[model samples]
Target: MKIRSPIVSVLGTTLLDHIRGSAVASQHIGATEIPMDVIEGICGDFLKKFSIRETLPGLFFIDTPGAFTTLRKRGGALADLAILIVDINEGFKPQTQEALNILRMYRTPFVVAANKIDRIHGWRVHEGRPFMETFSKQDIQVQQKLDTKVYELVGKLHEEGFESERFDRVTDFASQVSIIPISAITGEGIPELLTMLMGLAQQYLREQLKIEEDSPARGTILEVKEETGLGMTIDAVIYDGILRKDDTIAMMTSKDVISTRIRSLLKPRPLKFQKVDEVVAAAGIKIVAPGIDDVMAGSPLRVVTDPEKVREEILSEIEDIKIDTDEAGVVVKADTLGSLEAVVKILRDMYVPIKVADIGDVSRRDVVNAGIALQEDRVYGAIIAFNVKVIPSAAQELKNSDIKLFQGNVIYRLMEEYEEWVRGIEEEKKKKWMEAIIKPASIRLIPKLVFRQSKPAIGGVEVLTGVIRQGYPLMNDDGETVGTVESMQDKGENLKSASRGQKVAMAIKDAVYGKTIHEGDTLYVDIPENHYHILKEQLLTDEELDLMDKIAEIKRKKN
Candidate 1:
């Protein structure tokens, strides 16, 4: 059956294997890894059970593992269309958000498949029903619950500024996103989902995929497995153009670039490579590449003639991948791919620039490298570590250097500290600007007698530095607000000419005799500087500290 449509990439959590019948049926234990042999067996079983004769034409399904590390390695966001397989009962999982964020970040078109509708009790969904079967009485009730949960999930996306809808009723493809409920086991909505994909492709992406057949094939490597005798084999979906036998292709591995020749090719069924002249667009092909090792999953693959040019293009393309940053970017070092991806995503959303992101432990070389790269006038970008320790030499180097090193096992804390650092940098900039804008002058309080009252009106002031004005606000040495100047007099004469080292008696307005104003308070007159800093400090003093103390006490109680 040939169905022409835009290629749709399938992604979900590793947990999908359990729901898809690839999981081991266990009583004492839960489903773990879906054995490679079982996966092959299931593919063969599926083909036999469905009586499928040929692969769907113009529709390419690239099945990828749900690991974010794998997704990053495989370039998951490069897909033209993505199928987000979410469990219906499980509404939104942790990995689901990760996948969604990646797709959203790349602005890739996608549909949500709320799978496992068959699990709902008394649902009345018959076995082997066609994909578009309507809901039964029980099914409707279950669906109501499911819909409410899904709506809540969609509401979150809406809050994040993305519009989404249910797939069956969607009309406008450009503005609205869709989620289709399906039972992959019951085959309830698979056909319709495939039909929708075909419709979208034929209408929107036909020109891109149906371009000249001779164009170089471009795709992403979904999986790279080591077969006993075959060495390194890659399962890649060709998104555009064709790939023929003996074609020299550039495959991006996790660690390095690999250039190799296609020795053989294989499709999903038949379990063997056919010596085909060419593989067209939207076809998943398995190829044996000679001398390829340590192939990175989720890496982009392209057919290239000029190795240097291809390398340069790939490097340049990676550069366009924007890393989020605040005013001061962060320097990140991590040993694991999962940790690195999580840190990068959190930091990016916080607008914290990743000045330097790499895979390794914190080293003296890294500190020196950052110090050399950072501007002298600015605070050195903070050095961050995830589940990794800094070397002794690096620790010593950091002590001698200005680079702030922050390490934590908890990602949230690490991000919080980095956020605080960014805020601090912003506040420091504001303080500098405010200081430059307003010139400060010291003034002395003047003690005076009241005109009619017997008690003395005590207000004595001095112009120790700059000129003291009548209306300038007053702040103490500790940056506390005292009051504004009501009247300024020099030598018992009304004068505004109080200069450096001059004493001036001033009757301040609204001055509290004992509380806000005192006889010996040395007030510095200046305008307010850095409103955010002032407010934040005040808030922390008023509430944050007390709240934190309460939280700590609670933790202690729990312990």
Candidate 2:
């Protein structure tokens, strides 16, 4: 496939119809040899496997698995113009944000295929009509609902510094990302989507897609799998330069480069699995290699014309990615250079400090390096592992340590879990602090609700501010400590505590209802002088500060 034309690869197995029938789906095989997550695609994508020229040129289209497409790397890029599939009905989800973020980071131009348009209520349309024409025909309510969903994603994009609107609404191509609504299920607005992508590429990317006379081979290792016949084959997309059979290639590694002779340059097949051939650039190529093992996906590839120069170039590329890490931060381990790059980017995006970021499984040394974080900040004392495993050997060492291990296939989710954990710890500390430092609260007793007249007065009350809990010391405007709250209830259900604006029933010890304390009276939860000073500096919200001031004012006259 020469690929003068645009090719599409999505993040998931979005196509499961006729395309899937000829496809043998993969399982948990992308990075891990173990069954956890797999790269799902057609058994043999027609574009990559066959050179249909009978011998020659192409406005070629090469289809690749997301394993190749998702890498936002410079060369051998999977998508030139991407069809970022977003479920219109669901709007922008976490996964959607992750995709959008990567696109923005890579600067990949895209059109949001706002799929699931048919699911919108009463969305009637002429299947071939232009999107705007069909959209305008819909009833007002339907139009607004559709607009709301479209704008929901537009709003999210705006958060990331991208300005987008419905495709037709876009005035400037350079400044605004276009949003195209479609229904994969109904086949509405797809032709327009394809036509738009084609038009944009021709107008913008003609210079980029031009044939190179002497293109240097630079690509990204998309997949390295152990397949039958070709003991281990590297499925790669050469985004720059041409790679032919017998070309010496540089395979990048963490420590050093392994120069290998291309054992066979092959093209994939629809039925026979794969066939050998020379591959012209801007296409995915299959390589049988003897020198590479655990060849990380997204490893940058280049032809080795000058052995010394190529090695330096490869190592330099790695150095550029393996950037300057913080002296103190969380430890991270990913499966490949690309995975590590993405993981580090995401961590840095969240402003999470990273002590060490590298590739490979959870090693004992990694745990040691990871533990360095624990002594500084408990939350920082964690290892973020993505698309890799805790090797059995290292799992024992990890279990013995206090260092938290957040492992997952998804990058954002790993960061998300760690942040939540950090929040949990902070909240727990605050909870303990609040309990230790007694806080002031004011409650108003409702009239005619006193169940008990003396000994311990029971009545209905509304909390005006602060918090009321079991056994809180009570006070009134008369400057009397009316004894602790004996018990509290809300709608006959036991309540451990009540906050502002809640109406709850309570029993107070040592306050005589018929004497000093009566219905329609306001009672303040007493804050002793010592307790007030300890808590005065700790109010975390404006409302808490206001309540504390009122309590201080009420406690003033007693002086």
Candidate 3:
């Protein structure tokens, strides 16, 4: 049997719900989304219990939410290949933008699955829509619309320096991205999708999988789980090298290092820890180990085979991954497994680290834990409640403490407020830097006088803090020249000298009120400086960068 070499990671939300038979009401319940950690765990379980190893020997699958927010949290564009599923009629959505951004940022290749062609009425069996049940005049028209929409998307992507094509028509893999029209509901084009993936993996990534069996194994963590009796179990898809039973491996997580033994190895479906002496490259296996209690999703996993000293050296080679910090960390509470994962992914991409993210309502321990975590002076993490409630005691504790508690039914808005808070901090820093350089002397406002012909009378009046002047140049808030002060008047009387706090109305020359001095706008006087510094240092955390890349890519293609 020819084993597939490249791993195919599936990233999308599972909780796709529609209102009865209404396609319009079939919205993603992102608020109740699964946590990335849990998603990983369940995926691991799927691998262990489903026997995916036997079905597609070298191919590994990882699933993630298609929600833009979740994608943002994953350090954008981590996928080597993406399978984007779009409803034929829906065309494109916000989540599509999120996914596209990631592909663009990583320059990752992808194929679009124009799903639900079976739902299209009177659809003709085109080369792309081979899965449609019946072909009628209406079906032909619908298929044409779908094809046209996909072509338009491709054209838009081309403008952004990427070339894409329908998978059936594409000959070159390196230059052109492919789109396959499929119906997941009808199981149409599924085989072709698999065949394409296997073919592409064999052509592009085969060499990387050809490593020594005894060498250290390097792979990505698909999920992490806790067994009642087995402690912590890690579900990982080994991409390179070999992993043996009873091997002591050094694993890295978001929290810390976990050095543990590979208690047993279990393949998907069969669910038995076969005492296989060793596992080769490109196989998905579950490893039962100790001290992996806090393993995080999306963290890379590497198996160590050398002695303790050599293992230390290998660990040192990898630097500690740091996530951006905000004054407030996130407090995430969700009801469902998928919803929690989705929220965590979204927040992580926004560069908002979660101080506490779990599945349940606010508890006394949660409040105490959040309070303790908030003791750090530099961190300002918030507690986000997602369709979960806080007990009276916990709510009181949070109120008493300085922790910010955000409870809402809408996840996007909750995230939006948190992002705004982060932005506000950036803006404040800019204001402070500007104020430090240009000191304010006195506060004064000039009246807006609307004149008839010629030009509107333009003048600004101000009392000097330390000195009196008759002819001083006027500058706007941006330190650009507005006009020069023509003459100064003090309290309805012409005066040459005016002291501090004295009110003065001075006629300004060569300034238009509507163009330069609009109503309710402030004007300042200052000299220009070559300060080209950014108002704030805008750094995207790993997750944020990934989310932004996908969103941008999709937007590029859509337009």
Candidate 4:
């Protein structure tokens, strides 16, 4: 109603409530313990809807998870301005560093909330005081410490391509990003943080926040819920004109667009749902309706006067999500069609092939399709879900199967997870595959060393070139299969294996002395055809590889 309520998204929502002297109760939707694999699929739900609080009168705050950078892109998209919360003691984190880049990418004007000032060493608590008031009261040493920490943040921001200064130091608001030092624990510097946001909103975003009173209301659905008395209701942020009770509303989902009449409207305050007949632009409102059970979060909501036109527009948007394209790759699922296209573009840019891409909760069919891809390529046999739910059945199937599942609201983090998994699998396969490949070796029977005439003839042989192991098949110079090494003894002690220049007594299986093989005859390892390529390609040593080629040549000549 009043200049669109100046929608500002805070990166760390918990700290905002801390400033307001209250705890955000419903902020944690899926708070109960769940497996991490399942958490990834559902965690994206947080990104789709706005968990908002009107901290300042008519100032609506869209909140995002403080712990994730994946939700930053979505958060930046909705906000005219943003407050980035960074732990003062910890400085810029890997995720926080990424958050700044995202803000820059969206070109969203933001002020840094350098948090946890109370955490600085030897600092006294000035609870609920503005940073300037507390700074003057502090000792010189504590003031210097705070300066050092704030400069550290400025230094980091500079490296991240942002020109920044302390909140009070900035003269040119358009050029330099302002840094607001805050302590959520003690409510210190909160007054300054709020003032800066209000100043920016009133001055810089004047035109952006203006709303027309007669225009139809448009919003992004925050969530769909089944209340105890109300059958199905949608919690949404009305960002445009006005939403009234009994108004015809058309909402978009991953599948299709659906229309319903708003039965009632409710506004959420600190701890109460104030029932309202109508709510204006840029406000959080709960909509009770008849046909909203299938309404997806992250989907657009509109007070529609023309049903056919709106329906056609939404359907065209849904058609943008393309799935099942390549011969093989990852299966992708996202809460909305827009997010699904974003994920698809990112994966394709990284040269990651996609077997399927769809919008909605991850289904058993998605898991099953990944399993099929798993049978062919382990790297591609995975599911990357962005801001979507993973059905319990699909999660269970993923737990049992070897297929990989990577989920996040952030596209980069999901790729990191998938790439790390691929590296691990590749290392394991290399080690195991090498173990099954036989090495090349050459050996010669010593003259007058035959100790048996038949039945696994016992004799002494010298390892002429490489190592020989028990169970390694033997072949004659003519490329005919002789016999495998049965047992080996070195100076009366049993040996499992032997190497070059070693003369050892061995029992040869299936070779008869003076019949098929004779004393002083040379033999080589009969490398299996299946293993031959691998040994030649990777496993064999330079000397062993040359010997292997000669053996192959000999076999080729004999054939």
Candidate 5:
């Protein structure tokens, strides 16, 4: 009797131990039977008789691929449970934070694996022990680092609006996320990871695991693959109901939905269930269907037998996947439905508008759509794809035109990188808008530092405000030209410019020491009106405009 919880993708940054967690979980090769492993704990001796395998073989998977179930509400819906792995050393990185945002958005209930504890200096190893026992045995200094790193994550989760604590310190399981420290490379804390995943399954997923007899099968398309003989087929995870051979499935295209019968259905059994007549909910199944050329990754599918019902389901499904558009926004494309949801959720939080949130390769169609957004607003004119490829034609079109394309495996990186590019474009715009204005500066002559007199007076001055660059005209407080600074030095070191709070000595090119200037004289940077106007008009920065206000006030008084 084969049975188990759905696949739980070990999701997070590469440093969060994606590959290594898979490796570690593989060590516990799936047992096809459970209770064969016995319960030895004291509470088990009194409360109930529990076997190790508990249910059928589908108890614990070292790595589950990804989601199903609804977590968006307390009222209840199905959404996949997830293990959010975070590196203790690095804490929440760009991708880690992004993963959490999606998890929280979907209200995906998850446990945090505080991975990479072995990276800590002086850390003790107790590979088979629970994370807490192993942690308790650590040295004081090691424990301190652990506390600091763990609390750093606690703080981050707080900022992310999560109440989090070490697994041992937690009081409210439903309200707080548990953090378990681990070493993915050394296999430390693997046991605890397994137990926590199993615990979550046992406690919360009891209802989700129940599959009604002979109900309609609803699954999301994980990927489209090409088989050796079958040609193209789908790898889907069925979250609810049963999918039978020859059942009509409602699938989507970029344009609309259509129904197709399942030609063949396959399930992975160590030896025999490889080809099955039917598959149950919360299981990964491979499907063979004809003419799937238009189907995209992340397509949602449901088995419907009646032609009239199929038509209604098709219309409703089409309406569900529809994209809401604006006259302006950036283009976004992701590999699957889940991926797009996470990417879009983040983009919305960042307040970046979405022109298109679709699936598949960055098509030429995508480039054209982004170009339209460009016409409305150039800063919004870009395409970002997560966990998807870019068609060569699309790449070529973007290169030859002003429209930009950003593609990456990580959702957070895609947004971060796009914003960086936008900021660069904004800076360029600011430069052009304020191109002609020279920066302002002010200085006070140091008393008793008259090194020369007349033709080229040499003296020391303390920069009081702004910046003084080479050849900037230095005028006295009355706005009289005291002459330009020809060159400057800092205790024998030459400087191209001196900013406020710096002491530098420079040669005044023309003003005579006795008449035009004197020791302890105060002067203002002579920023003219035409230059000052641009600084105030550009929305570049408020402080820069205010800094000019001081200079403007000084020049106004003198003019």
Candidate 6:
């Protein structure tokens, strides 16, 4: 027999509790499934009911692996309510924020569990009790640290556009987000966590959780695995109606619509699945079938009587996995359709254009396509492979090519490295361009400082503005070519360049002090017309720009 219950999904950051909230929202919403034993241990209550060897009515909790999975909407769509767990030790991380955004984007009602409260030094544990019970037993100093940490989380939530308070203090759950401080390790504050979820579920989600009589069985595939004797099987959650043995099932994958007849239906009992004839809504079950290996996690499953109509619905759902392509950008490859969708979604949000996205390992064809983007734009010429290997053949293509390949297990770190590489290339290009242009500078010859008259004019000069570099061509106030700067010396030290407000002994070649140049006459560094415009438009500061304008007026008057 089935009882109507609200489905809850657990989400959090990487490495906290190993159960993240949203589908593929963070780094590892997994192309491969997480071990069932691990989930069985973390959620013992859900499994305990299974070990009783009978399917019963209870709250369904979906434990997403660590982070975001690629089925972006599926995480938010399926859950009636969600629990966003954040590590109290590390307040707001990238993955946690992504999980919270999924909740906000879907408008899914959720309560925050400020997890790891036991890790706070000197916290006294009242194991499995609500937060206040444990909090009341702690020392004043321990209690203060708890308040400080929880408030920091409250501050961060505010910054993220949420009004939140301690779960106990919340007067109205609808107006403010409730935060339950709990230690998953010691089980403190867990009672409150459950109470808050149940309260919200009954008050707000009553209508949503009510099962429709005799509705078609609708579920989401959590994992498609190879069972020892059953061949390929799928561990799924039936959220709507009853699923039975011998029912024709239809689901969508990255490639095609999967149509198959269920050979058996089993409910989870510890590490094993107890064979069953039928299972009700709001329960987890494993389905065994032939030709089910290609079925994907996060795909929707339906028990269908109308084959043609159901297949069309599945096909339309597959189209939701669309990848937006730009005219020119980096190529992206991942192990699964959902993984590709996840990477593409984040990259697009970061304003990184993606030219192509596809499933499977990085191939020689990928290298060739990336090379094309490289030829068009160096910054965008690269490949981002997330949880996918680069084939050996593609390695050979990359050996002689300039196309960059960024591969990583973590999406944020991979994107960071790529963005850093782009910055490096831009800086190098700017340096090369700057080298080709002569700088603008003005120098006033100092009085009584002439060291030579012929062969080359040597004198002390004070820089009026801008920079003067060695080998710069010099022009007089009348704009006639005077000479080139041979070298500059300051206090017995040779200088490759000198900037504004400095007095240095300068050696000018191809000029004499009495004729070609003279003391007290301010001379400007001869800048090419093209370089002048570039400096004015792209590189120069306001002060330096005014000086360039003055130099330009002087040259125009002479012209």
Tell me the TM-score of each prediction against the true structure. Answer: 0.61, 0.61, 0.52, 0.58, 0.60, 0.69
| Best TM-score among the predictions, by candidate number | 6
User: Deviation in angstroms for 210 in model 1?
Assistant: 3.0
Local accuracy of candidate 3 as per-residue lDDT tens digits, 125-239: 4432233222233445675866786687677657646687777678687777776666655545544454455445434553433556556765555568865566678766565
Per-residue lDDT tens digits for candidate 6, residues 209-244, read 667536778777878888787888888777778788
Q: Which residue pairs in candidate 6 collide? A: 11-20, 11-21, 23-69, 24-68, 24-69, 25-68, 25-69, 26-68
Q: Per TM-score, what order, best first? A: 6, 2, 1, 5, 4, 3
Per-residue CA lDDT of candidate 1, range 1-559, in tens? Answer: 1223344457673324333343343110111122223333433333233211222333334455443343332333435566778887767765576567666765566777878877766566754343345444345667586567668757766875668767656668666667777777665655445444444443445344443456787765656777667778887766566788778888655456767888876653321334456676556677788866666555667788689987766554444332323334457876554456556766766675566666668888778756754654344556888778898988887886567788876665676676687688778876776533334456655445223111233365666555557676766555556666766666668864566667756656555655666656666654444432343433332333443333334334434
Give the per-residue Cα lDDT of candidate 5 at 393.
Answer: 89
lDDT of candidate model 1 versus the reference = 0.58
Q: C-alpha displacement of 316 in model 6, angstroms?
A: 5.3
Candidate 1 vs candidate 5, lDDT winner = 5
lDDT tens readout by residue for model 2, 52-82: 2222222233344335333535433456666
- In model 2, the worst 10-residue window by lDDT is 31-40
lDDT of 5 by residue, 1-559 (tens): 1244544555673422433333334311111111213212211222122232356334323223233221121121234467887889988887677667667766656889998898888997875455666788999899999889999999999998999998768888787998878776655665556555555655566545556646788666655778788878887767667889878887776676777788888765551236778877655677889978677666677897676776676566444333647676788887766566667767776888888887789988788888888987688888888889889987787785678878788766777788899899988887876544467667888988888887688898898776777788878776678898888999989997888679888788887777898888876667777776755455333444565677777677757
Tell me the TM-score of model 5.
0.60
Q: Could you tell me how far off, in angstroms, the CA of residue 194 lies in candidate 2 after the best superposition?
A: 2.7
| TM value for model 1 | 0.61
Q: Which parts of model 3 are misplaced by more than 4 Å?
A: 1-4, 13-58, 63-79, 124-139, 149-163, 168-176, 195-207, 228-231, 253-255, 269-275, 307-318, 323-559
RMSD of each: 13.2, 11.5, 15.3, 10.8, 10.0, 8.6
Q: What is the C-alpha lDDT of each candidate?
A: 0.58, 0.68, 0.52, 0.72, 0.68, 0.74
